[PDB]
Ligand binder design. Sequence first.
Ligand code: ZN
Length: 716
Amino acid sequence: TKAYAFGFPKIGEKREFKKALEDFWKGKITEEQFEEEMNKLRMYMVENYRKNVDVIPSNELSYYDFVLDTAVMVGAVPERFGEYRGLSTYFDMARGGKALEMTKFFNTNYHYLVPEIETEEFYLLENKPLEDYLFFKSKGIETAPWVIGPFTFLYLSKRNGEWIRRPNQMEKLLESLVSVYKEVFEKLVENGCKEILVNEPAFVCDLEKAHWDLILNVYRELSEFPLTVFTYYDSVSDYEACVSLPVKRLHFDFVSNEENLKNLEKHGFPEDKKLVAGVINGRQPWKVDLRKVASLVEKLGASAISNSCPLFHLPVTLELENNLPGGLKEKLAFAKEKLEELKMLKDFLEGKTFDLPLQAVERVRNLPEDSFRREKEYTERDRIQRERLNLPLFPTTTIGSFPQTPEVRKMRSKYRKKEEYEAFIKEQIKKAIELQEEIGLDVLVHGEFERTDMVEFFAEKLNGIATTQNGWVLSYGSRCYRPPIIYGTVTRPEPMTLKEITYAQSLTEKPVKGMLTGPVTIMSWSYYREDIPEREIAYQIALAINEEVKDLEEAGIKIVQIDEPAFREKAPIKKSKWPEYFEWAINAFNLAANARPETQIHAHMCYSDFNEIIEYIHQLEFDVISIEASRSKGEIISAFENFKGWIKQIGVGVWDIHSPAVPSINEMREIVERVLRVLPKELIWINPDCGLKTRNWDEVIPSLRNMVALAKEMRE
Ligand SMILES: [Zn+2]
């Protein structure tokens, strides 16, 4: 049994990767020092592989992003960066002022950099696969370079501001592209490379027959090389076309979906090649019953095994996590432990090893069918809310978070590392409330000074959810986070945000909004049990959140905001599966947002465009939705304008909070004036695009004053 693994985390057990990057960016260390740090990580990674599997990947230590690495390999460096000068340029492309766009890698919380294709001509600018292959080879360690395949690379790239995903857009680029892959592979083989790991996750996307025609041509041109093709994150819809590819080894993800297995049972698997069975989950941290896995492997008739999808979605190691809820650690397995499972699975399959390792649940299961809608419909709630709030036309507000002083950051760190902290928080809130009132904002926020991030803050306060000490996972570049683990029934023992919001409201006559995170978002940034349906977990969390809403309502809070960024982001990769997904995502949100008619519910959505989801948005029980309209100068409004029967209020983001610039009153006006083209003025709120936690006070205060001034003008 041939054992593969891929995507082992690169960050190191002590996050040496993060420290190396930031120490280089801040100049604390030289480039030669940086490369020495990197070389340590390389060896650490392969040593983990060497101890556990048969095929050892190289070219996996990307200094920022592997898609960016691919772009550089094929010479796709945009004109604005000029001559490619190595690391300096690389990091300018990744994190510079004019950096490439960053976006989510398929349906995961990893973010890659979007290549920009300016020329139709690709060339070999740098051969990192050969470089890394020789690095390990010189040490007497044979490795298989890990590369992003030509189709997927193009599929993840943009040209002229748009994806390159229509078959008629890809053809010519593919021809030039493949030529560069041919050169790279030839160099590898000429140097004695025996196997190359080609990643083609885009094969699991909604493709047409014409895509597969192009893909067929690409791999015909590469059929002389020893390639193993990997696919993951979902099933490959056109199974027959996929197993027809002229490659000798093909990997499928048999964990994230049922269709791969079903299709394999139907059409069988070509004798002309070998199956690599991706059967150990790369995305969840649960130890599996290896006897069950072994049986699956036999049913598949596979002679090779591996993880289903990249291991870098897991933390490095469980070893030192010794303050987890009793009995939990024994059910877990992080990246290192996943390699060990593969080794054990191989050992078992080869015969070398014989020993292998309600009250709230009822509420959910028995939810009345009426629980998923609010008491009164929008039109009637609206009159009640407006009468209660007495807001002016074009009310102004903000999205929730405020700038964090070094003091605020340090204090929060100290506390995490109670009475003194609370006092400090109450102090910053008073200041923020007074500042907002002085500026003349209509609806206020408490600023979220007490929160690290919108998921961890709540995860830490919910039963059934654990948080780790060192379970770091790379989000992008040098930024890591620790995903919570939803290990049991989720409930909310005590109020989570009452203290802060209540105090805040007691300082002003103006409405102060409650500030919560939705259920799907909490799930999306966490690990969770697989023996229970996603929807039931979401509902549990949603009911817990609704507990907070009621408590907020009881304390007299008139407005509650529920941020659900994962609404679209957790949608399946396959469009055909959307309706079933949104059915429960909608239900989950509505359970959380089940508020009295008198309570105005706000929902913030970060999406750059709502055209594909407007139909699902229309089913949510919010009263106000805030959108980020600045970057499109208001054109994002099109989806709402063209939705016959849109009657809900819209919070128009008129200010790009990812920039230090203070927008002029006219710059904001352009946006507000655009949204007012069709929609009635009574629906329009004015706010920033998003939270202000990344901004500085010096730029926020002037921007807010301009926002208020604009509202005043607009009313007149
Ligand atoms: Zn946002």
